[PDB]
Design a protein around this ligand. Sequence first.
Ligand SMILES: CSCC[C@H](N)C(O)(O)c1nccs1
Ligand SMILES: [Co+2]
Ligand SMILES: [Co+2]
Ligand SMILES: [Co+2]
Length: 249
Amino acid sequence: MIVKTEEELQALKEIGYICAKVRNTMQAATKPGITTKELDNIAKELFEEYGAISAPIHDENFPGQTCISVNEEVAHGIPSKRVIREGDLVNIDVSALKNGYYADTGISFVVGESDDPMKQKVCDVATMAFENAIAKVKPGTKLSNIGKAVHNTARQNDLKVIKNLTGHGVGLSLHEAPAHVLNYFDPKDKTLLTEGMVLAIEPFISSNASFVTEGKNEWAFETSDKSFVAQIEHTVIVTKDGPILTTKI
Ligand SMILES: CSCC[C@H](N)C(O)(O)c1nccs1
Ligand SMILES: [Co+2]
Ligand SMILES: [Co+2]
Ligand SMILES: [Co+2]
C-alpha cells in the first residue's frame, strides 16, 4: 500500500511490532527437542494476546499460524510434530493483520552448532543482502535496484539467490503491488518506489540451488539438492527521510 495518513502509519507500526515480537519469541524458544508445532503455538497465544490474526490462515488458509521451514525446506513449511535438532537451519516467517493492516517478517538461523559452517554463512549473507537492499531505498529509486543489491551481495560471497521466491507489496493485504520484488536485476523493469510505499523485502540466499521446487506436501518449498538457504524479511516503508522498518525492534 501507499501510506497517506498518520493513522495508517500507526496501524502498520502496531502490527509490525506484533510480528517482530512473535518472531523474536519463537526464535528464542527454538532449541533441540521442541517441535515446530510447539513453536507455532507461541504465535497462537501472542497473536491472541495482541489482538492480531495470522495472515497465512486468513489470506491463504494455511494450516498453521506461521510458516516454519527446516533444512531441506526453504519456505512455507507447515508446523508439525517435526522435532528441532542440533545444527538445524530454521526459517521462521511471521505475518499477520490487525485492524485491517498487515506486516510480514522472517528470519533464518542455526540451532546451536552445525558441522557445516555454510549454514551460518548463508544466514550471515542474507542479513548483509537485506542491509544492502534497503540502503538503496528512497522515493524515485528503481524497484530493480533491490534485486541488483541482493544478487550482488550473493555473488560477492560466492553464493546464489533463489530466483523464484520474491518480496512483495504489503499493507492492506499480505501480497499487493508491487507484485514481485526480485532477488536479482531485471534490466527491463522501470517500476519505481514512491513516498509511502510499503514493501516486504525478503532476500533468499542459497549455498547452491538458484530456485525452489514443490516439497513434501502441498505447501513447502524445498531444494532437491538440499541447499542451505537463508531468508531475512522485514516490512519497510519508503520515506523521504529513509526506510522505516515496522518489523524491526
Ligand atoms: C504462505 S503465506 C506466507 C508468505 C510469506 N510470508 C512470504 O510472503 O514472506 C514468502 N514469500 C515467498 C516465500 S516466503
Ligand atoms: Co513472510
Ligand atoms: Co513475504
Ligand atoms: Co510471499
